[PDB]
Each structure stands twice: as structure tokens, then as C-alpha cells.
């Protein structure tokens, strides 16, 4: 019974691998040999946001590139201003251990999570002047690792019980529940059209999930280890991923296989965060050996290194208009690199 | 413009208020000592700190604030998560110590505990953090060894050629057999800790029982030693 089902699963697996081999007419490196290289991109720390107490685990930008939310492990959610290095808000959290934070596209709300398996939303209307817990989401078993806002209505979240959920913020209940994963789902990145989203996990596979349909359209079995971070290409047709095997991979949604592998022999350390730029030509990868590498997405080549962090660069984000890159590490300092 | 200068002044005033709040929180954060409580389900990790404690239950985590000698210890127990723990353990690099409570009575599951210890110890992000080892349920070890029903030699072949350590100081209410078994389990954990680890973190092994009030004192002493050794290594003495 089980043997027959596993045999049919292996036959489907072989059929998918055959289809992927067939579709592979030529690699990205062969097609992009006749492309002008980027060369060297020296970026410097224009502004340093200081005064965090514990390690900065995640961050998220805004749609106007002004405010940036950061989260720390002391129980602080600090909404920053990138331009005038001022702290626009600072939110004391119920649980000290917080592993995610999202900023809403409207800027009304800000969401956090962590080991207390609750997604906490904080309003920013401030009719009294003090921020308050707006609603707590308690429907996960595992640890909440990433959250991202579709809008003020729906929020997509990424737990550690091998599930992802679509939550209604006003209702407080899970609209949809994605149960395809077999490992700790580490982060997810919404597409710009927001119909689809990809979710890396620790099962060495990235899933392409349809929001409305509630099932996974695609499965990406390219990595050799835990996919720590995931980031869509700005068109929404491809997406890059970063793992503990010191490799970033670029996967096409259309081809449903790995377009390119970003690996260097001198790197043995994992990749905590990946974020594309606005054009998508540079792939910014936050590594575990205390620096960030600016890969060339078309040429598979390093362009630069952001060696300004004492400890592990936990999170890396890029503004929507492309102005600068904020990297937050475990040394309690948050750098802006331009 | 004047309006922009008013908005900048208001933002700077709010920044100064938030900086003041962060300085008070920095005092509270530095005063408080984080302790990661790790163990198994059959073990007695919930019952280690007995008296003079407050117990808080969040939805995904258990906390335990206690004050020993004007020193605040906040112990976190992560019991509402899935068995895979290689990713959320990275969060606990900032803790002063990891209190690992192992049920020494269960001989079948003692090797699982040793594997857990090896995993925690050999982590890249737990190379700084010192593990406080509590070998719990000593009275069960005494009764089990004296009774003779289960053989520790079967689960561990090394116990036959094992000899009692000279630095080992037995309690008054003990026998040579129970002392052999007890210190053999301690030596197995110390062998795993000593063998593969660097000079940045050490394993403090303590024998404790189901009813034992002295455990907060032991954790206070161990945390004090951990910070002293950290300072000594920073000053290049150790």
C-alpha cells in the first residue's frame, strides 16, 4: 500500500525531473556571457541606527522608504526613520523573543511574532498617543518566523509547525492554511501583484503558493540544506533563495527549476538573508561570516562586500524605490549601506 | 522652512523620550540574566527552582523570574514547539547560560540526552554560552542502582572498566555503587563537553533531586562563575 504510493511518487518525481531536464535548453551563464559586467560596487555605511539592546533579528521597510521597522530580542519593536536617524516609535513587546516584523503598505499597522506562537499587530493611529496591541493571533503551534502584509485586511504568516497561514486581521481567524511543507518554514516573500507567494523552508525546497486557491502551485527542490531566506525578483516571475550550504539559488517560476547558483569556494558559512534590488541586477546576500555579498544576478559574480558588521547579519532589506540597503546584525547595530 | 523645523523638533523630542525609555529598559535588560531551560519530557526541569519564584505562562513559552541575592534571573522554557529545534535555538545566543536538566534515572533515554548535550555544546552559536548541567532525580538513581533490577552496564559498556574519580566527593547518604553510577554519568557529560569544545564555555555539573531548595543558589553560583571566567578570558588571564 505504502510501497505502491511511494513508487508512484518516485515515478512522478522522475517525470518532473525529466521535464526540467528537457526544458533546460541553455543555462543563464551561457546566455549572459555576452553581457557587460557590473564590476565593483563599493557601498558605504551612510547612517548607523544604534541603541538596540539585544540582537536585531528582522527588519522591514516602508513603501515611501521613510520608516523602517526593526525587531530585537529584548522585547523591542523600534520603528525608525532612515533619513534623520530618529526613533519614530518603540514598542515594548509581551514576549522578549521576537523573530519577525512587518510594516504595512498603508503604514497603519506593524506586525511582530516570535516563539510565543502569536502574531501581534500594533496600530499606529495613536489617538491617545501610546501604541497598543491591536489584535493577537493565536492559532499556530510552531514558532512564528516571518510575517508580511498583503494589506490591512489580510496578513500572510510563516510558522514553525510546517504551515503558513493567511489571517484576517479584523476577524482574528485563519482564512487559509498552507500545509504542504515538511520542515520549519523560515521566511516568505510576497509577490508585487500579491496573487502568489513563495515560502522557503528547512526541507530544502521552496513552495510557490496561490493565495486565493490555497494550494502550492510549484515546488523547488534545488537546495542542499535549510532555505533560510527567500526573495522574489521584482517582476514576480523568478525568485532567489539563500541557504546554510553557502549557496544562493535563482529559480524561475515558469521553468520550475534553478536558473542559477551563486556559490563561492571561500565561503562555507550560511546565508541568513537575501534581498533583491529594484532592478534585480544585483542580488544582495547577507551571510553568516559577518559580511554581505553583492552578487551579480546575471553573471553569477561578486561585485562588492559590506564588511561593517561585528556579528551575523540576521536581516537585509532594500527600499522599494531602491535608495539604500539596511542590514541588521547580531551585534545590536543596524547599518544603512548605500 | 519653519513648518519643517517644527516637525523636526517634534521628532527630536519624541526621539529623546524614546531614548530615555530605552535607557531605563537598558538598565533593566542588563540587570536581568537570561537562562535557557532545556530538557526532556520525562525530566523534572519544571521543578528545578522550588522556592522564591514567580511563574509566567505565555502561549508558546514558560518564564520563571526569581531573585537570588538582589540579582534577577529570568529563565525561559520552550515547551510548545515542534521537535525540530535547530533554528529557534539560534535566538538564545544572548543568554548568560543554558540550564540543561537531564533525567539520569532513565538509562534508556540517557544517550538521547547525551546527544542533545553534544548538539547544544557543539553549536556554532552556543560556543560562548556555558551550559549548567543538572543531573536530576538522584534518589531514583540510588533506588535503581541499589535494587539491581536494571543494569547500567548494558546501556553503557564503558561503566565496567570505569573507576570512581579522586576529586569526587560523595554525600553522607551514599554507597559506592550509587557514587560510581552518578559520577559516571557526570563524567560522560563532562567528556563530551571537554573533548570538542573551546575555552569559551564550560559545563557546570550539579546533582539535584525532586525536592531540593538549593538549586537557585547553585544557578547563582554558576552564573557568577560564568561571568568571572568571561572577564578573566577578556583580560587574557584564562
Amino acid at each position: 500500500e505504502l510501497d505502491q504510493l511511494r513508487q508512484e511518487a518516485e515515478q512522478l518525481k522522475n517525470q518532473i525531473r525529466d521535464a526540467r531536464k528537457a526544458c533546460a535548453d541553455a543555462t543563464l551563464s551561457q546566455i549572459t556571457n555576452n553581457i557587460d559586467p557590473v564590476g565593483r560596487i563599493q557601498m558605504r555605511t551612510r547612517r548607523t541606527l544604534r541603541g538596540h539592546l539585544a540582537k536585531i533579528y528582522a527588519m522591514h521597510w516602508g513603501t515611501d522608504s521613510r520608516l523602517l521597522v526593526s525587531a530585537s530580542q529584548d522585547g523591542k519593536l523600534i520603528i525608525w526613520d532612515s533619513y534623520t536617524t530618529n526613533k519614530v516609535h518603540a514598542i515594548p513587546l509581551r514576549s522578549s523573543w521576537v523573530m519577525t516584523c512587518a510594516y504595512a503598505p498603508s503604514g497603519n499597522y506593524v506586525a511582530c511574532g516570535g516563539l510565543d506562537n502569536i502574531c501581534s499587530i500594533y496600530n499606529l493611529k495613536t489617538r491617545e498617543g501610546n501604541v497598543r496591541v491591536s489584535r493577537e493571533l493565536a492559532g499556530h503551534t510552531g514558532y512564528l518566523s516571518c510575517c508580511r502584509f498583503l494589506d490591512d485586511n489580510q496578513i500572510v504568516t510563516s510558522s514553525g509547525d510546517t504551515t503558513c497561514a493567511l489571517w484576517d486581521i479584523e476577524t482574528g481567524q485563519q482564512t487559509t492554511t498552507f500545509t504542504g511543507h515538511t520542515g520549519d518554514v523560515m521566511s516568505l516573500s510576497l509577490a508585487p501583484d500579491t496573487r502568489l507567494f513563495v515560502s522557503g523552508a528547512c526541507d530544502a525546497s521552496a513552495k510557490l503558493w496561490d493565495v486565493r486557491e490555497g494550494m502550492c502551485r510549484q515546488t523547488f527542490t534545488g537546495h542542499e540544506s535549510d532555505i533560510n531566506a527567500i526573495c522574489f525578483f521584482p517582476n514576480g516571475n523568478a525568485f532567489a533563495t539563500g541557504s546554510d550550504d553557502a549557496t544562493c539559488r535563482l529559480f524561475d517560476l515558469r521553468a520550475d527549476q534553478e536558473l542559477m547558483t551563486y556559490s563561492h569556494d571561500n565561503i562555507i558559512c550560511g546565508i541568513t538573508s537575501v534581498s533583491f534590488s529594484k532592478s534585480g541586477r544585483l542580488l544582495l546576500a547577507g551571510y553568516d561570516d559577518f559580511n554581505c555579498n553583492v552578487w551579480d544576478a546575471l553573471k553569477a559574480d561578486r561585485a562588492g562586500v559590506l564588511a561593517g558588521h561585528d556579528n551575523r547579519v540576521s536581516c537585509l532589506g532594500v527600499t522599494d524605490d531602491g535608495m539604500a540597503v539596511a542590514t541588521g546584525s547580531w551585534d545590536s547595530f543596524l547599518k544603512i549601506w548605500n | 522652512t519653519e513648518d519643517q523645523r517644527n516637525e523636526e523638533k517634534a521628532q527630536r523630542e519624541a526621539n529623546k523620550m524614546i531614548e530615555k525609555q530605552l535607557q531605563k529598559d537598558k538598565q533593566v535588560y542588563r540587570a536581568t540574566h537570561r537562562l535557557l531551560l532545556l530538557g526532556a519530557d520525562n525530566s523534572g526541569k519544571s521543578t528545578i527552582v522550588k522556592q522564591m519564584r514567580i511563574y509566567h505562562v505565555n502561549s508558546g513559552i514558560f518564564e520563571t523570574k526569581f531573585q537570588v541575592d538582589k540579582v534577577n534571573f529570568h529563565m525561559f522554557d520552550v515547551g510548545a514547539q515542534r521537535d525540530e529545534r535547530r533554528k529557534w535555538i539560534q535566538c538564545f545566543n544572548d543568554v548568560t547560560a543554558i540550564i540543561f536538566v537531564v533525567d539520569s534515572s532513565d538509562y534508556n533515554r540517557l544517550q538521547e540526552a547525551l546527544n542533545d548535550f553534544k548538539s547544544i555544546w557543539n553549536n556554532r552559536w552556543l560556543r560562548t554560552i556555558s551550559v549548567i548541567l543538572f543531573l536530576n532525580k538522584q534518589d531514583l538513581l540510588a533506588e535503581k542502582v541499589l535494587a539491581g533490577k536494571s543494569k547500567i552496564e548494558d546501556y553503557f559498556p564503558e561503566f565496567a572498566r570505569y573507576t570512581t574519580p579522586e576529586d569526587a566527593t560523595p554525600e553522607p547518604g551514599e554507597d559506592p555503587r550509587v557514587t560510581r553510577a552518578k559520577y559516571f554519568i557526570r563524567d560522560e557529560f563532562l567528556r563530551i563537553s571537554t573533548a570538542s569544545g573551546d575555552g569559551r564555555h564550560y559545563c557546570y555539573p550539579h546533582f539535584t533531586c525532586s525536592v531540593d531548595t538549593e538549586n537557585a543558589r547553585r544557578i547563582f553560583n554558576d552564573c557568577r562563575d560564568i561571568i568571572q571566567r568571561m572577564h578573566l578570558r577578556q583580560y587574557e588571564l584564562l
Partner: nanobody
Amino acid sequence: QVQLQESGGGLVQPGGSLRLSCAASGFTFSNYKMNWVRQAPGKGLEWVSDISQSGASISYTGSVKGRFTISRDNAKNTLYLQMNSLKPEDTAVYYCARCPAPFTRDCFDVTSTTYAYRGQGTQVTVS
């Protein structure tokens, strides 16, 4: 795709010799510490043995030491477990598992109910 296929197993007499071969596909074999984990019927998973990147560092479980041998072939990309002097009590669904990160010595959750990098399993019965 990371896949480990275990070969061997079946009913053997006690004291018999059995080789368990785990064919490792979809990753670079040398970089990863690997290990063997067995699940007894009606019991939890238990770590049996491990082997490092080079193969120099090897450890065992107490209940299997001296009569189990773990070898890794990098060129043939295979993990071998040589079982001799088998007892009837330790009959199990043997499993071949891979520690998650390369160039590392920490294997946190190789003994867990759901684990990503583990084969389907090979039943070794000793009667």
C-alpha cells in the same frame, strides 16, 4: 533534491552479518556530517552512529559499540553500516540521516518525528 536511499535489511538470524548501504543523491557528499538512526517497533527514534566529513571522527551509541562499523565512501557517494553479532532485541527501521549544515559538528534534530533529510527506511529484522 536531497534523497537518501537505504539498501539491505530483511530477516536475519541473530549473530548474522548485514551491510546497510545508503546511496546519497542530490548534494555534495564530503561537506556534510552524516549519521545512522534506528526506530524500534513501538519505540522512539534513537541515534545509532555518526561519521564526520573526513571520516576521522566517529562515535557510537553504548548499546551498539564494538559490533557496528560506519564507513563513508566519498567517490562512490555511499554510507555503509556493517552489522555483526546482532541481538534479537535491536530489530528496527534503520534510517540514514544527514546533519543539516555543512562544515559543522552540531546535529540537533536528527532524532525527531518529522525530519527533512532522512530516507524512507530499511527494516532490519533479527529473529
